[PDB]
Amino acid sequence: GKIRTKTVKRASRQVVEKYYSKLNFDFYQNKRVIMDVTIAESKKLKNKIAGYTTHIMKRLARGPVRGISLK
Amino acid sequence: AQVGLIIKVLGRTGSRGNVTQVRVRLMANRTIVRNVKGPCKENDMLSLMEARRL
Amino acid sequence: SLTLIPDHFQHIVRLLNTNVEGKRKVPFALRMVKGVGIRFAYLVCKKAGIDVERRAGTLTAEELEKIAEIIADPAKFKIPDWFLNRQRDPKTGKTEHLSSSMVDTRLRDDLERLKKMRAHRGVRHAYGLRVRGQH
Amino acid sequence: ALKQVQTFGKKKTAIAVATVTKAAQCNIKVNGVPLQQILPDTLRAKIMEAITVVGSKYYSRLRIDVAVHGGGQVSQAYAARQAIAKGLIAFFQKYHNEVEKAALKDKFLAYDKFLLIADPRRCEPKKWGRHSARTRFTKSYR
Amino acid sequence: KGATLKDVSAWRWIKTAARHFKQEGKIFVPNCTEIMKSSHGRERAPQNPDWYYIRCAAVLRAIYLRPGVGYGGLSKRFGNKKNYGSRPEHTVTSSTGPLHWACKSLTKLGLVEPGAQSGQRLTRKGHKFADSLAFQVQIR
Amino acid sequence: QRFNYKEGKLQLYVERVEVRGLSAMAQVESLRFKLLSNLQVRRAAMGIIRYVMESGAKGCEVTVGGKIKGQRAKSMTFRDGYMIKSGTAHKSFVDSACRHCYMRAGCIGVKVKIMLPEPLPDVITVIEPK
Amino acid sequence: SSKTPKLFNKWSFEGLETSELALRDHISTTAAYVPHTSGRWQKRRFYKARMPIVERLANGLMFKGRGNGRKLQAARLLKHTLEIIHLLTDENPLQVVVDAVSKGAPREDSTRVGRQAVDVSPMRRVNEAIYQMCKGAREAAFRNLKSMPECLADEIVNASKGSSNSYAIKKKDEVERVAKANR
Amino acid sequence: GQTVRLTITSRNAKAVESVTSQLLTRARDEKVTIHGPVRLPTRTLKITTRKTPCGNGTNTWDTFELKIYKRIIDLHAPTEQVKKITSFTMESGVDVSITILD
Amino acid sequence: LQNAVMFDKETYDKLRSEVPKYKLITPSIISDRLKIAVSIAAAGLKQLCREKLIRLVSCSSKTRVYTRIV
RNA sequence: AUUCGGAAUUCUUCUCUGCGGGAUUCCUUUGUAGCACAAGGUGAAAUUUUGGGCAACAGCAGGUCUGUGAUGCUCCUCAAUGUUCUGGGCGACACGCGCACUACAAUGUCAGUGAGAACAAGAACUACUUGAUCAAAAGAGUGGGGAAACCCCGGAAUCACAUAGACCCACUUGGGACCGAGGAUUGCAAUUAUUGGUCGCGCAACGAGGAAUGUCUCGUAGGCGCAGCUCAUCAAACUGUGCCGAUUACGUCCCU
Ligand SMILES: [K+]
Ligand SMILES: [Mg+2]
Ligand SMILES: [Mg+2]
Ligand SMILES: [Mg+2]
Ligand SMILES: [Mg+2]
Ligand code: NA
Ligand code: NA
Ligand code: NA
């Protein structure tokens, strides 16, 4: 696709806060991590969630990200 | 018929958008703005036997 | 076929009171007669012993008399009855082949006979209408 | 010993299965017919491309038998040239080095991608209210 | 050194075999062959003076490739598209009349025999004849 | 008799439905009972919605249409809760029914749609760690 | 033991070049064996500038309902066409063909932006040179005794020389003259 | 001895796979040689018809499809052994036919 | 328009003395120079090839292109 | 060495399919001023991957009371607007209009020869082989075989042919409308032709079509045949399937 929806972006942000020390900048390891820590009936959706989660992690390595509170 | 080289595509003029506005560099270094019919892109080469910018 | 023009080449030939072009191949020059088609004109060429690769207009009168005799009555030469146009004529019962001016005159008799007895095909023919159930 | 490999290739519906073997004299046949009896001469030049591109010295002692089913006149000439080209690569992988195989594989790709990779295009279904995949019924107003 | 069928041009085998049948002068030709259309899907007569010999050589080669084939099977091979006038065209199989006569002529020559419970297949003599002719065309 | 089954070869048993507030087949027949009696249409439709929502449903909808008042037909719907309407999975998370009730004049047709609470196609939950 | 391909196993692709600098990058001279290939040439915007020039000619002969989809027949028509070009010119048939598409389309055109004289993109000169020559031959052989290989050969040979007896050169002279007036 | 062929056919995909997976486990308990199962091609039944009941507006159609699933297992055991393998409560929609191979 | 269907004395010797001096020879080209049908023009060219007075160049079922022998 | 059609072993490259894997703007760079875009890479597939299905809230005095044992209110009701039987009509016309089929030819017509699909359906009617055949075709008639096992190695038509075949620019071997005389088949019943096959007529327009106008962006347009449905008999229609396979644009708000 081109543009991600609210369902993807909201869910992909809970993943970052709960599991921040199991993620890195690689899409393929992140997807394997995500499929074990979430429930959903469509593999297409889980692919996009891991796609955006990788994008967030790169931004966090640079500076703070709005709406993400690691605490 | 001197030759010219297209260095930038200004925009798509015309009512129906079938004519392009380009700036050519006379390879025969002067930049002249001309109208072009047909599909064209940068670094092309016309065979010139100005125009108002869009 | 690199054969020179004969001095007797006939650009127009006469057969069964019909003009026939003297430039076509023999089977396709006899189709110009009424009652002789493409399929029938090849059989006439075989029975007369004429090569089908010649131009009509090179053949002589003896060939033309044999041609006009096969067409007149195709029975003595073994041409089967399922090959003739008028079989079991309704008013005489005799099988025959109609050609030249006899094709038209007997068609006139068929229409006049249907109209005389007031049949449905007769009245439709008289009024200049369609007779085979075309809307 | 036997030195046998089997490959395949498809174009639209044609499936061509090859069988490359080590023999004494070069021999390529398609569905039984030898290579020089294939017609038209245009479609025979497409199949021979799977040989001229690399050179015939690499087919020096190989015997290839191709059996094609499905498709049509031109689909089967394209499926058969894939199986022959993929067959040479598969035989070199199983009985030669990687340096020799890699040189062959790039030459095939530098000429035509579809000498080793299948074309994925297939017929588009027909939809109601249309005469074809994309042509609608004629419209009239008055 | 030797050669078999399928190693030679399909036509050049048929053209050579048809010459063999005509020159030997032993095959049996029906009388209806001089006045007949090869099928009811055709428009005119075959127009080749030796058209029965060409089919018998073509029928014999067909039986060689597909043993057990019958008259209905061969008619599929010799079909065509019919001109229906102002209506769309369709496919019509050939008539099995002339195919019945072609298998009779070859059977009397000893080249073809009835098959095992179905169809027609060529005998050992027909196998020698077919392959011997294929070597003759190959050496030109 | 209809199917010519031989004697001793056919048997029927009757089992009871678990909860009557989640079957639109039974609910529509309760609604028709009120309608064939002297009952207000709004008071009739409010009973069904409140009952099924109280019984544990996830989304409900009642539609009554056709010559309700006057000589002109009209449609009256009553919605409550959440209800999906598109896709293929809507044939498993929604139950529906219909009936034709014979009034003194004309006809009345009523439908009831109940959303039965596999997860939803587009819901994602993240497991709490530790 | 590879060897460079030759068109129809006879005509050489070595030394092929265009004398028109503008069109050099839009005519493709990559060697091939036959004018037939199955590639997705209409997937990107500038992919038809790489398809070989002789194959583009064979695609222009498949016009009208009679000619739609007959690509093997179009290759055979071109096989005889190049033979006649060799006898008429005594030159390489492939050098004559690329000399024709470089002289068959107008360098200046007039359009309805305001009409106004407008220059023509190099991709349009190549496309229009093929279209005008294929059309000029197809209409000159409709109810004629000549066959189409002889009509097409006369079109290409005349266009390469700039002769006015070509259909494409007639249209190019008219269009260029009209556009100059609208300048 | 003899070979018995079992044919499983039903309109539901899950029901077919549940019964066949049961028979294999029961067969292996009796220590019986097995040939299969084989997944035969599934036939698709199609009916297409117009939506309108009066013939008005645009001509719109809908297509209704049905699928049929089929499996076969060949055993090697006499009748009594087979009479014990398949004696269970299969769910509705699935049928099993016993055939003795030649 | 009006094309002859058989050779005469004057056309035949022209076919055997002038056609062999043409760079490009085709059934259609010889037809309009001698005013004969393309059916008998094709037969005359097949005769000249058989005696080896012109050279075949491109042969097909429906197309034939000849030229000078040298 | 190469071909063709008894006994054996083994084995899943191709075929079959229930649940899985795979693609995510993933990677690099540009324009850059967070959301994103363009070109390229990886790759079977690179942008909603492709094609469909389902689709909110409101409305139309849109269609249907010829579907229904869904109905309000009406009408007729015993030589009846109920029901059955016989005959006719819905098919009538040198008039007008919408949508199709066939053509106006040589990139062709005719006569041969070659190689070669997919989706389907079948009484449980579909179809093979052999007679007929010491002589047209269509037909008749005998034995057998069935649902990935029979039909079936599914012998489709475009297509190809170095086929040393015919025709040669003309309303002509283009086109096949209209009509005549035999004969067979479906049916209780072919006279308004039920349909098919043989010979004849072809002297019926038609040589590319005024003003206007429809659909279409890649296995697509166009061309070519094949199944299903209606069906005792009849497809120039519709619903699907495969075969050959392009030109142009990848833009704009001029018309709608
Ligand atoms: K026709
Ligand atoms: Mg319409
Ligand atoms: Mg047609
Ligand atoms: Mg053709
Ligand atoms: Mg209808
Ligand atoms: Na036709
Ligand atoms: Na109304
Ligand atoms: Na419009």
CATH number of the domain encompassing residue D5: 3.30.230.10
Q: Are strands B45-48 and B2-13 parallel, antiparallel or unpaired?
A: antiparallel
Q: How far is the CA of E84 from the centre of ligand 2 (A)?
A: 27
Residues H1, H76: Cα–Cα separation, whole Å: 8
CA dihedral D100, D106, D112, D117 (to 10 degrees): 80
Contact G132, G100 (CB under 8 A): no
Residues F46, F56: Cα–Cα separation, whole Å: 16
Which amino acid is it at E17? A
Please enumerate in sequence order all residues whose Cβ is within 8 A of that of E94, keeping only pairs 6 or more positions apart, or say none.
E38, E39, E41, E74, E75, E77, E78, E79, E80
Residues F64, F76: Cα–Cα separation, whole Å: 5
Which amino acid is it at C33? V
Q: Are strands B2-13 and B19-26 parallel, antiparallel or unpaired?
A: antiparallel
Give the angle F104-F105-F110 at the CA atoms, nearest 5°.
90
CATH class belonging to I1-70: mainly alpha
Give the angle F42-F48-F49 at the CA atoms, nearest 5°.
85
Residues on chain C bordering chain E, Cβ-to-Cβ distance under 8 angstroms: 38-39, 42-43, 46, 79-80, 83
Distance D109 CA to J215 C1' (A): 40
Which amino acid is it at C80? P
Which amino acid is it at B49? M
Q: Is G64 annotated as a binding residue?
A: no
H52: Cα within 13 Å, side-chain hemisphere: 7
Residue E94: count of CB within 10 angstroms of its CB: 21
Chain E positions touching D33 (Cβ under 8 A) are 6
Provide the domain count of chain D.
1
Ligand nearest to the CA of E90: 3
Q: Which window residues (143-182, chain G) lie with Cβ within 7 Å of strand J?
A: 143-145, 147-148
Residues G89, G86: Cα–Cα separation, whole Å: 6
Question: Which nucleotide minimizes the distance between its C1' and the CA of F104?
Answer: J72
Long-range contacts of I62-67, Cβ-Cβ distance < 8 Å, separation of 24 or more? I63/G80, I63/G147, I63/G149, I64/I26, I64/I27, I65/G80, I65/G83, I65/G84, I65/G87, I65/I24, I65/I25, I65/I26, I66/I25, I66/I26, I67/G87, I67/I22, I67/I23, I67/I24, I67/I25
D90: helix, strand or coil: helix
Resolution in units of Å: 2.9
Strand J nucleotides with an atom less than 7 Å from a protein beta carbon: 1-5, 13-19, 21-27, 34-37, 39-40, 44-45, 47-59, 61-64, 66-68, 70-73, 91-94, 98-103, 105-108, 110-121, 128-138, 148, 152-170, 173, 176-183, 191-194, 197-203, 207, 214-226, 235-254
- Report residue G87 as tokens: 């006898």
CA neighbor of D86 nearest in space, from D11, D14, D19: D19
H63 CB-to-strand J distance under 7 Å? yes
Domain that includes residue D69, residue range: 1-142
Distance E91 CA to J225 C1' (A): 8
Q: Does I51 touch chain C (CB under 8 A)?
A: no
Burial of D7 (0-12, 13-18, 19+ CB in 10 A): buried
Domain-wise residue ranges, chain B: 1-54
**Eight-class DSSP state of I25:** B
Ligand nearest to the CA of D140: 2
Helix axes G53-60, G71-89, angle to 10 degrees: 120
Contact C117, C90 (CB under 8 A): no
Instruction: Quote the CATH superfamily of domain B1-54.
Output: Nucleic acid-binding proteins (2.40.50.140)
Q: First and final CA of chain D: distance in angstroms?
A: 80
Do the two chains F and I touch, given a threshold of 8 Å on CB pairs and at least 3 pairs? no
Q: How far is the CA of E89 from the centre of ligand 3 (A)?
A: 6
Burial of I66 (0-12, 13-18, 19+ CB in 10 A): buried
H21 CB-to-strand J distance under 7 Å? no
Contact F23, F17 (CB under 8 A): yes
Technique behind this structure?
cryo-EM
Contact B31, B23 (CB under 8 A): yes
**Eight-class DSSP state of C118:** T
Question: What number of H helices and E strands is found in chain G?
Answer: 7, 2
Chain H positions touching D129 (Cβ under 8 A) are 58-61
- Which CATH architecture does the domain made up of F19-130 adopt? 2-Layer Sandwich (3.30)
Q: How far is the CA of D85 from the centre of ligand 6 (A)?
A: 42
Distance D140 CA to J93 C1' (A): 27
G64 CB-to-strand J distance under 7 Å? yes
Burial of G67 (0-12, 13-18, 19+ CB in 10 A): middle
Contact E38, E98 (CB under 8 A): yes
Q: Does G33 touch chain D (CB under 8 A)?
A: yes
A67: helix, strand or coil: coil
Neighbouring-strand partners of residue F64 = F76, F110
Give the angle G53-G57-G60 at the CA atoms, nearest 5°.
140
CA neighbor of F81 nearest in space, from F71, F93, F92, F69: F93
E6: Cα within 13 Å, side-chain hemisphere: 10
Neighbouring-strand partners of residue G119 = B36, G108
Residues G119, G109: Cα–Cα separation, whole Å: 6
- Distances, alpha carbon F46 to alpha carbons B22, F34, F77, G84, H27, in Å: 71, 12, 11, 92, 58
Q: Is the peptide bond before D40 cis (omega within 30 degrees of 0)?
A: yes
Chain E positions touching C80 (Cβ under 8 A) are 35
